[PDB]
Amino acid sequence: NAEASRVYEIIVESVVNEVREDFENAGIDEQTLQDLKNIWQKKLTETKDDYLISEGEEDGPDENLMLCLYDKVTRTKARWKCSLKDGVVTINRNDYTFQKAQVEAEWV
């Protein structure tokens, strides 16, 4: 929503700033920095047997994926509690960013 857009803007500004030094160190003009940033911004704006899991591929925009870190994992027979950290999630073509999350899972 608002918070996700603001944080994404911090990532954009910080990365574009930090990256330029290596580009200049090797002879790459400052025009490329602008080109990469503008096109990158445009794409963000517009975009917003059964056992064998080896044949797994990104379904597309529809799929919901969590990239996060795990503090620790607890073991229970039915409940599967798990503390998670530093995660960005995308559900129903919307982006929600968090520092920590708690997931409780059920072992059918």
């Binding site: 503090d71 620790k72 607890t74 509690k81 798990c82 503390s83 708690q102």
Partner: protein, 82 residues
């Protein structure tokens, strides 16, 4: 609710430790303060014991390693080897 491992030192455990120490009445922040103190103490003793272990080229922390770690700091412990 899932809690941190340091929170695994539950409030009744700290209260029992206080009762053995003679503490009739306990505040509400004594639990967090005691968890922090215990974490610091355990960090020091386990760091010393893991150093003793790494010197012996072992991958398992031995009870004698903990006894030697405790003995240098003067907090001697009887009952796990001499």
């Amino acid at each position: 609710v899932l809690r941190d491992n340091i929170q695994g030192i539950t409030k009744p455990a700290i209260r029992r430790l206080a009762r053995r120490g003679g503490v009739k009445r306990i505040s509400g922040l004594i639990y967090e303060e005691t968890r922090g103190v215990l974490k610091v103490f355990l960090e020091n003793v386990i760091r010393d014991a893991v150093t003793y272990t790494e010197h012996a080229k072992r991958k398992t922390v031995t009870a004698m390693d903990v006894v030697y770690a405790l003995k240098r700091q003067g907090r001697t412990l009887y009952g796990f080897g001499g």
